[PDB]
Amino acid sequence: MEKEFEQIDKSGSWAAIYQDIRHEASDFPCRVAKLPKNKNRNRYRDVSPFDHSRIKLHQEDNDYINASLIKMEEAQRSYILTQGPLPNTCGHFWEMVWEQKSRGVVMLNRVMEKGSLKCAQYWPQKEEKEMIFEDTNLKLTLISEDIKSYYTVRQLELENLTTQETREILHFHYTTWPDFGVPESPASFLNFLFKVRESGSLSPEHGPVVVHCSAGIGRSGTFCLADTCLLLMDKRKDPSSVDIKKVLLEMRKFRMGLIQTADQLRFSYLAVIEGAKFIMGDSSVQDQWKELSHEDL
Numbered sequence: 583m584e585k586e587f588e589q590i591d592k593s594g595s596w597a598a599i600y601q602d603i604r605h606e607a608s609d610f611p612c613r614v615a616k617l618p619k620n621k622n623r624n625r626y627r628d629v630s631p632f633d634h635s636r637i638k639l640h641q642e643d644n645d646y647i648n649a650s651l652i653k654m655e656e657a658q659r660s661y662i663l664t665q666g667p668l669p670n671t672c673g674h675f676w677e678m679v680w681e682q683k684s685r686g687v688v689m690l691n692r693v694m695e696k697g698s699l700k701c702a703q704y705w706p707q708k709e710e711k712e713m714i715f716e717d718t719n720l721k722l723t724l725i726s727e728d729i730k731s732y733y734t735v736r737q738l739e740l741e742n743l744t745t746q747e748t749r750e751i752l753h754f755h756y757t758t759w760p761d762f763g764v765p766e767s768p769a770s771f772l773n774f775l776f777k778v779r780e781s782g783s784l785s786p787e788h789g790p791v792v793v794h795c796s797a798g799i800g801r802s803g804t805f806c807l808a809d810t811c812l813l814l815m816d817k818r819k820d821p822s823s824v825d826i827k828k829v830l831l832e833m834r835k836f837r838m839g840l841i842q843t844a845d846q847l848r849f850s851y852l853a854v855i856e857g858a859k860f861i862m863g864d865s866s867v868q869d870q871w872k873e874l875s876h877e878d879l
């Protein structure tokens with residue numbers, strides 16, 4: 583895998599490789615997303631979920647949410663990629679989390695980035711100030727939070743007011759991943775990812791983990807591509823067989839525009855190439871990533 587990487591770097595062909603992916607990517611209808619009544623449920627007019635893979639709310643009224651089920655068959659892992667909730671779809675967001683039985687939520691952006699709102703504050707910042715999303719009859723409470731230098735893990739209690747059932751939802755929030763940018767290093771990215779893995783939130787016993795950034799395609803796509811590829815390397819007889827460009831195209835059949843810049847594509851290679859070391863056995867690389875990520879700053 584690192585040979586193709588090396589030749590692409592030498593060829594200076596990341597932009598061409600990336601644009602070939604954009605040109606060969608699937609194109610499916612998003613008619614429900616474009617209905618007039620769903621306009622205020624979409625954050626960006628040009629980022630919509632395909633009809634065949636969109637997540638449907640269980641409500642009779644309007645089952646629309648800008649969210650997509652990315653189902654990776656060979657890797658055996660599903661992910662729900664959605665945009666950062668809007669002030670009016672925070673209820674919907676948690677209704678989806680509930681209905682799909684998700685156990686973890688991976689946030690890769692901040693609410694405000696370089697002076698622009700990118701996502702509503704959809705979870706409570708203070709223990710004593712819980713949230714109620716009336717339209718859905720769900721209560722959400724911040725139970726605790728473990729704040730690190732570039733990421734925070736939070737324990738939330740989501741409750742179905744109707745049946746009074748409660749569930750613990752884990753929130754994995756990467757706070758230093760610039761929009762249209764890349765993580766500081768493969769190490770800090772992988773250190774984060776393996777934290778989500780180790781939590782059990784990605785277990786096939788739970789519903790799909792919900793991943794989102796602002797549009798739910800660039801950073802969210804980088805995160806899922808890397809995870810899927812590492813899963814594939816550990817599954818196959820010959821890990822060098824994983825074609826990342828092919829995997830990204832498979833994912834793009836489920837949601838448009840996954841991976842938004844050639845450099846995020848390149849970062850994906852680096853993250854996977856670096857992550858292969860743990861998958862092949864190396865039992866010390868994880869401590870190395872942790873040190874390199876300086877999480878305890």
Ligand SMILES: O=C1C[C@@H](c2ccc(C[C@H](NS(=O)(=O)c3cccc(F)c3)C3=N[C@H](CCc4ccccc4)CN3)cc2)S(=O)(=O)N1
Nearest residue numbers: 626627628761762763795796797798799800801838839842
């Ligand atoms: O690294 C990233 C990029 C962010 C991102 C991606 C896309 C958008 C949508 C935005 N729409 S717009 O109405 O402000 C806007 C801005 C400029 C031109 C235009 F016609 C509309 C955006 N679209 C193009 C990208 C288009 C696109 C490509 C492929 C699939 C879907 C959309 C670039 N930024 C916002 C943020 S992420 O939160 O997904 N992670």
Ligand SMILES: [Mg+2]
Nearest residue numbers: 707708709710
């Ligand atoms: Mg306090």
